[PDB]
């Protein structure tokens, strides 16, 4: 039984190969107390830090897809194997996922930790974009992976990846959460501490949506109360939000709302296709696959369909593939790959690693 672990910026999905959904999904946070104990555990990880967050300092070990603290990163992995999956890491091979264009220094640490700290028998690292294509049952298409830290567009054609056309956008769910906190203060609600960041993230995951026409939705919001929703805070207080429901997701298509000089996700996807050869752009237009939790907003597929169509030539057929389980597309693709009979030759044994080093994982990987 092989383990498939997908480490993201905000969430960590874990499970067993062959299943249809991750068995363990918990936030990738480490919380530490910020008060003094008066009544006679110095850190909390995952859902335990989420239930005690009123007295904890929540810190994300991964920021923008960059591990800011490896000591806290090992806590997430240790919590995964022993507390969530409740399995011994030394008895099951582990399949890991990595972001596209992952630095080799980052990949070596992940390989080094798995083989020396957890002593896993076998290990393999796969591209998140490729795995998301496995879950959709395709060998050709461009995957717009938008998670919690960073957004990536990876065009894949007939099983061949094009690294030169991969574009990176430093804008994801965490930036949207911080923007929602900024615009909620305009309505009189102050969310400042890290514990209230998770509250706003819950608001964003429940009441935010992408408007087909942003300017038209603004006019309706200023002349009617049909788009207003109410949310209940943990203490029972009810807050009401109006145009903030579609203003926060609008930062994806208009990064200027955050003061960013880059283009929106629609143009990043379009620019990535244009960096490919002309003979393959037609297939990438009709096989645009969305992935990650930041693509779960209602109407984002329709808006992305509209925006790219205005950019692409009129003769091209634009098709946005948004499966309803795209939030776990990376993990589902990993479980499928780890169950294939042709994948057993891709395992890197622990015995091979200590006698060869990280040179064998740079090869046999992409």
């Amino acid at each position: 039984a092989a383990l498939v672990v997908d480490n993201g910026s905000g969430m960590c999905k874990a499970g067993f190969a062959g299943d249809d959904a991750p068995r363990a999904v918990f936030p990738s946070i480490v919380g530490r107390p910020r008060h003094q104990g008066v009544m006679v555990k110095d850190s909390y990880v995952g859902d335990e830090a989420q239930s005690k967050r009123g007295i904890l300092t929540l810190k994300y070990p991964i920021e923008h897809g960059i591990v800011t603290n490896w000591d806290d990163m090992e806590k997430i992995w240790h919590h995964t194997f022993y507390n969530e999956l409740r399995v011994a890491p030394e008895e099951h091979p582990v399949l890991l996922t990595e972001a596209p264009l992952n630095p080799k220094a980052n990949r070596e640490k992940m390989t080094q930790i798995m083989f020396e700290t957890f002593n896993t028998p076998a290990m393999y690292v796969a591209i998140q974009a490729v795995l998301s294509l496995y879950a959709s049952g395709r060998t050709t298409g461009i995957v717009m992976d938008s998670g919690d830290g960073v957004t990536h567009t990876v065009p894949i054609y007939e099983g061949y990846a094009l690294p030169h056309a991969i574009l990176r956008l430093d804008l994801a769910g965490r930036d949207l959460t911080d923007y929602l906190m900024k615009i909620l203060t305009e309505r009189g609600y102050s969310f400042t501490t890290t514990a209230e960041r998770e509250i706003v993230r819950d608001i964003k995951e429940k009441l935010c949506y992408v408007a087909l026409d942003f300017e038209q939705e603004m006019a309706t919001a200023a002349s009617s109360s049909s788009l207003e929703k109410s949310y209940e805070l943990p203490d029972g207080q009810v807050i009401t939000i109006g145009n903030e429901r579609f203003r926060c997701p609008e930062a994806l298509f208009q990064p200027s709302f955050l003061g960013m000089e880059s283009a929106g996700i629609h143009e990043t996807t379009f620019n990535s296709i244009m960096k490919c050869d002309v003979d393959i752009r037609k297939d990438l237009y009709a096989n645009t696959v969305l992935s990650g939790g930041t693509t779960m907003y209602p109407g984002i597929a329709d808006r992305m369909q509209k925006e790219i169509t205005a950019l692409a030539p009129s003769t091209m057929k634009i098709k946005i593939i948004a499966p309803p389980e795209r939030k776990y597309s990376v993990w589902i693709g990993g479980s499928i790959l780890a169950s294939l009979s042709t994948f057993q030759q891709m395992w890197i044994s622990k015995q091979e690693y200590d006698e060869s080093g990280p040179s064998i994982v740079h090869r046999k990987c992409f």
Partner: protein, 393 residues
């Protein structure tokens, strides 16, 4: 009677101000569980991440504040450095172990580095795998122990670059750490097979051994105390970190066995022979716990715990000669973050401002008692003691 009699029951830690710290230090990203820092009363050595090969940053203690990104480093190894250790009898000599399968001994100038240091004084090549364990002999001069991943223990002679002893068939699995005893005649070692071994290097014999000292599969440590006992940190079957004290004349059962918590990360014990206080710092933990080892049961008395909000990547302990005696300081720890080295001051609260005779007994000096040639013959001696009263201001 109501309270256990002690002097360090109220020791509290206090980090120094931001202007006394060391910022902009790219601390190493190696999974090896070492201290990553070695500090003497003169310099501060921190293992840093190098673009190619391996290097560690050596800067004078007065060079506080932000460190230049182009500051010269000791970059001679072709692989990342694993362990560093200052020579007890020479404040300007530091030995470094790396995964390039060699041990390099350096000579640091009195004012520090003006240009990157690439040539070492000695290149000691006797290991076939990476060397992550380095320990100087406490008494014998120019005697250095290096233990690599090939499960071999080697005794070097730094002055003559000779191989004094080779101990290859004594550790059947990977070695966690080694620690010399008080007089440097024996050394204890913790192995991956859950066994604690006490070894006499000059005779090449196993004095004592405890199989399954700690039942956990996670890494453990084993150090020697001044009275000759063995102090070990380890894990249980339920993955719960414990503390143990072992009598070398009776290894059937531990003298003490206390559990601390169920967190990950190896516990690195820092021992102060003068105060008989053991500081246990866990890699990735944000707290430092110190215990007092006495002859009264349960032989391990919890004193207190210094807590912070930042996990530590490494830790270095300043020897007694570099402490500010006039401020009732008994330990200074240079906590390593991922990009900063924050010294932490452990001080005994005392009302009097005079020199405290009880807090500061005679400590080992920077003068070697024996030499490599004499130690080989079979001579044994205690470290030369000096007085800290001259350091009072």
């Amino acid at each position: 009677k109501v309270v256990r009699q002690s002097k360090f029951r109220h020791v509290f830690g206090q980090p120094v101000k931001n202007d006394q710290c060391y910022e902009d230090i790219r601390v190493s990203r190696v999974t090896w569980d070492s201290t990553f820092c070695a500090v003497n009363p003169k310099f501060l050595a921190v293992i840093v991440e190098a673009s190619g090969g391996g290097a560690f940053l050596v800067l004078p203690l007065s060079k506080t504040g932000r460190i230049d990104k182009a500051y010269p480093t000791v970059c001679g190894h072709t692989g990342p450095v694993l362990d560093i250790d200052w020579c007890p009898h020479n404040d300007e000599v530091i030995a470094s172990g790396s995964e390039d399968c060699t041990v390099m001994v350096w000579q640091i100038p009195e004012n520090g580095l003006t240009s990157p240091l690439t040539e070492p004084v000695v290149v000691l090549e006797g290991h076939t795998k990476r060397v992550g364990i380095i320990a100087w002999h406490p008494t014998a001069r120019n005697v250095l122990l290096s233990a690599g991943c090939d499960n071999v223990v080697l005794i070097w002679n730094v002055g003559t670059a000779e191989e004094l002893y080779r101990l290859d068939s004594l550790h059947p699995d990977l070695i966690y750490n080694v620690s010399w005893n008080h007089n440097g005649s024996l050394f204890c070692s913790a192995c991956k097979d859950k066994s604690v071994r006490i070894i006499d290097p000059r005779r090449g014999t196993l004095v004592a051994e405890r199989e399954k000292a700690h039942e956990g599969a996670r890494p453990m440590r084993a150090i020697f105390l001044a009275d000759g006992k063995v102090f070990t940190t380890g894990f249980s079957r339920m993955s719960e970190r414990q503390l143990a004290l072992w009598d070398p004349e009776n290894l059937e059962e531990p003298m003490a066995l206390q559990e601390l918590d169920s967190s990950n990360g190896a516990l690195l014990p820092f021992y102060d022979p003068d105060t008989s206080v053991v500081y246990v710092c866990g890699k990735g933990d944000s707290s430092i716990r110190y215990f007092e080892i006495t002859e009264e049961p349960p032989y391990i008395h919890f004193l207190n715990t210094f807590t912070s909000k930042e996990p530590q990547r490494g830790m270095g302990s300043m020897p007694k000669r570099g402490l500010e005696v006039s401020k009732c300081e008994i330990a200074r720890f240079y906590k390593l973050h991922e990009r900063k080295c924050e010294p932490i001051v452990m001080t005994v609260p005392r009302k009097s401002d005079l020199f405290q005779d009880d807090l500061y007994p005679d400590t080992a000096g920077p003068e070697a008692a024996l030499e490599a040639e004499e130690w080989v013959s079979g001579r044994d001696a205690d470290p030369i003691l000096i007085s800290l009263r001259e350091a009072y201001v």
